[PDB]
Amino acid sequence: NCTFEYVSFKNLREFVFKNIDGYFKIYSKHTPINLVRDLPQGFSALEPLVDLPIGINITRFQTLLA
Amino acid sequence: NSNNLDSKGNYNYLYRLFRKSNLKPFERDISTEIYQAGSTPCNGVEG
Amino acid sequence: EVFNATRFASVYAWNRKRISNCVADYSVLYNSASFSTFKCYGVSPTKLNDLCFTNVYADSFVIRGDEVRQIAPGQTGKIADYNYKLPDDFTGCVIAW
Amino acid sequence: FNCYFPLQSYGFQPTNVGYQPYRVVVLSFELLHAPATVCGPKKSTNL
Amino acid sequence: QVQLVQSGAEVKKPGSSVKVSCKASGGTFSSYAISWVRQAPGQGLEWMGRIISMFGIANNAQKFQGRLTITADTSTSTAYMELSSLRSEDTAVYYCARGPYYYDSGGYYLDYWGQGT
Amino acid sequence: IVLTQSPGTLSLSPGERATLSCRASQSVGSGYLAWYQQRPGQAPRLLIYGASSRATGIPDRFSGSGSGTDFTLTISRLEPEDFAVYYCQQYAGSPRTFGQGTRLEI
Ligand SMILES: *[C@@H]1O[C@H](CO)[C@@H](O)[C@H](O)[C@H]1NC(C)=O
């Protein structure tokens, strides 16, 4: 029931969170932007960070803000 | 069935096991291969 | 590090340590002879280094010599069952020193 | 015959020899649809 | 039930050959891994050999290797020993051994011993 | 290999809980040692086999234990007929080897 604790507007942070075949994947990208209103007309490629075995029937997600 | 001609306890039948890792088809193998399977000591009375 | 810890917990309070994301040399465990009993049924110790599973839970505790004899499969007695049970069914090497 | 506190104690002493303590660790081995987090190493061979 | 008859005590000149019997009466002979032993007066007993009756093959203990020949005669249900190059120190009482070593059955060491030569 | 016993002779009157230990110099397996009992002017008789694997046909009073480098044979309830000489015996690899012997006296 628990697993490996993994230690590790002027800028835009992009994340793609997908769970595939029980393998949980983190994609991150940091880019500087000046258009604070809406998404810029830019191309960003998301690359893997780490892989993790959660593997459940995820149906909801909460963002957490300070 | 062999209950008629055998099964008295009858221990006559012997089957070879760990002596050979694998084995080619249709050869008869009678080699004793004294104590082989996998170990650091060899060739004696080993437990 | 687990074995060389100064104090182990009592047999009733068996510490459950989850094992993941680490390399285990089962073959070195078998070849090393400081470990007094390395009884094995499930998998051949030479191939053990090769074979790898996802989830391992390891149990640590201390008992008497007689109870080390008593904690054996297919045997009936006092300590074996009463306070910390090892099920008949599990696939898991029993290592005692 | 009333109560009998269940947590009786092992007595360990170096003169005690049938009562000599031996240390046992139990490993449980199981796999369920996850990366093999336990592994066996393989050395580098010179290229 | 099982017993191995002892002979009348023997004295031999050094360098000769001695034959010691080992009788089996009763039970299912040729299944057990028959062995061999002896004990010097005032000294502990020492093992010499092992004979697999079915394949009639034997091995010799290091200290006595090259001097002891062990064979098993299935027809007479007996175990035989041949010792050559006898010296002065070799004199002692000699015993015979049996007990079953099967394969993965455990119980490699067992009694089934007799009385002597 | 040397099978170190406890002790060469123990001069004990009947009834003690006697640990007749045997300590092989190198680890000999925890189901791999055996003890033999020789009656006076006789041939030894097996009492415990495979270190802890209780020999069939034998009463519980004799019981072998231990593992690793230190092994133990236990006498739980000494009886008058238990005075005798006992020999341990290597059961792992290599030729059968016997200890220098322990004579149990009254
Ligand atoms: C997680 O699983 C273990 C397995 O037995 C269980 O003991 C524990 O109670 C579970 N977690 C919670 C919060 O109940």
Solved using: cryo-EM
Closest CA to B32 of E93, E59, C4, F43: E59
Is residue B25 within 8 A of residue B43, CB to CB? The reply is no
- Nearest Cα to A4, choosing from D39, C57, C21, D29? C21
**For chain D, how many residues are written?**
47
Enumerate the residues of chain F whose CB falls inside 8 A of the CB of residue E107. Answer: 49-50, 53
Distance, CA of E21 to CA of E34 (rounded, Å) = 13
Task: Check: CB of residue E68 under 8 Å from CB of residue F95.
Answer: no
Distance (Å, whole) CA E101 – CA E47: 15
Structural domain total, chain F: 1
Nearest CA to CA, how far is B24 from chain E (Å)? 23
Chain D, residues 17-46, CB within 8 A of chain A, namely 33-35, 37
User: Is the CA virtual torsion E102, E108, E110, E112 positive or negative?
Assistant: positive
User: What are the tokens at E86?
Assistant: 């006898």
**Sign (positive/negative) of CA torsion E100, E106, E111, E116?**
positive
Q: C68 vs C45, C72, C95, D6, CA distance in Å? A: 22, 8, 10, 20
Which residue's structure tokens are 């000999």?
Answer: F28
Q: Closest residue of E to B43, CA-based?
A: E59
Give a three-class secondary structure readout of chain E.
CCCCCCCCCCCCCCCCCEEECCECCCCCCCCCCEEEEEECCCCCEEEEEEEECCCCEEEECHHHCCCEEEEEECCCCEEEEEECCCCHHHCCEEEEECCCCCCCCCCCCCCCCCCCC
E-assigned strand segments in D1-47: 21-30, 38-39
Please check whether residue F85 is in contact with residue F104, taking contact to mean a CB–CB distance below 8 angstroms: yes
Contact F69, F83 (CB under 8 A): no
DSSP string of A33-52, one letter each residue: ----SS--S-----EEEEEE
Interface test with D, best of F19, F61, F74 (most D CBs within 10 A): F19
A43 to each of A30, A32, E109, F24, how far by Cα in Å?
A: 12, 12, 78, 73
Rounded-to-integer distance, Cα C79 and Cα C77, Å:
6
Report CB contact under 8 Å: B44, F91: no
With beta carbons less than 8 A apart as the criterion, state whether F105 and E56 touch.
no
CA E40/CA E90 separation, integer angstroms:
9
In the stretch 21-40 of chain B, residues with CB closer than 8 A to chain F read 39
Distance from CA of A3 to the nearest CA of C (A): 7
Distance CA E72, CA E81 (A): 9
Using a CB-CB cut-off of 8 Å, the residues of chain F touching E99 are 46
Angle of CA points A1, A51, A55, to nearest 5°: 40
Inter-chain CB proximity E28 and B11 less than 8 Å: yes
Closest CA to F20 of F58, F55, F61, F68: F61
Residues 6+ apart with CB under 8 A from E61: E46, E47, E48, E49, E68, F95
**What range does the domain containing F14 cover?**
1-106
Residues 6+ apart with CB under 8 A from B18: B36, B37
Sign (positive/negative) of CA torsion C72, C78, C82, C84?
negative
Distance of alpha carbon F90 from its chain centroid, rounded? 11
Distance CA B40, CA E62 (A): 18
Nearest CA in chain C to A52: C21
What is the H or E stretch that residue C81 is in? helix C78-82
Strand partners, E18: E83
Pairing of strands F62-67, F70-75: antiparallel
Q: A57 CB contacts (<8 Å, ≥6 apart)? A: none
Q: In this complex, which chains have at least 3 CB pairs below 8 Å with chain F?
A: B, C, D, E
F33-38 vs F85-90, strand pairing mode: antiparallel
Chains D and B touch (3+ CB pairs under 8 A): no
- H or E, element range at C22: strand C22-23
Listed in sequence order, the residues at least 6 apart from C60 whose beta carbon sits closer than 8 Å to its beta carbon are C2, C8, C9, C14, C15, C17, D25, D26
Q: Which residue's entry shows tokens 């070195």?
A: C28
Neighbors of chain B by Cβ distance (3+ pairs < 8 Å): E, F
Whether F67 has its CB under 8 Å from any CB of chain C: the answer is: yes
> Phi and psi of A59, rounded to 5°?
-125, -10
How remote is the CA of residue A2 from the centroid of ligand 1, in Å? 9
Strands F62-67 and F3-5: unpaired
Query: F60: buried, middle or exposed (CB in 10 Å: 19+, 13-18, 0-12)?
Result: exposed
- The helix/strand/coil state of F38 is strand
Q: Is F5 on the interface with D (CB under 8 A)?
A: no
**Across the interface, which of D19, D39, D40 has its CB nearest the CB of C65?**
D19
Chain F residue with Cα closest to C34: F68
Rounded to an integer, what distance in angstroms lies between the CA atom of residue E112 and that of residue E96?
9
CA dist F52 and C66 (Å) reads 9
Asked if residues F91 and E108 have their Cβ atoms less than 8 Å apart, the reply is yes
Report the separation in Å between the CA atom of C18 and the middle of ligand 1, taken as the mean of its atom positions: 13
Q: How far is F75 from chain B (nearest CA, A)?
A: 26
User: Which chain F residue's Cα is nearest to E61?
Assistant: F95
> For residue F39, what is the DSSP state?
P
Residue of C nearest to F50 (CA): C69
Overall resolution, Å: 4.0
Rounded-to-integer distance, Cα F35 and Cα F22, Å: 9
Whole-number Å distance between alpha carbons of E51 and E86: 22
The reply to whether D17 touches chain F by the CB within 8 Å rule is yes
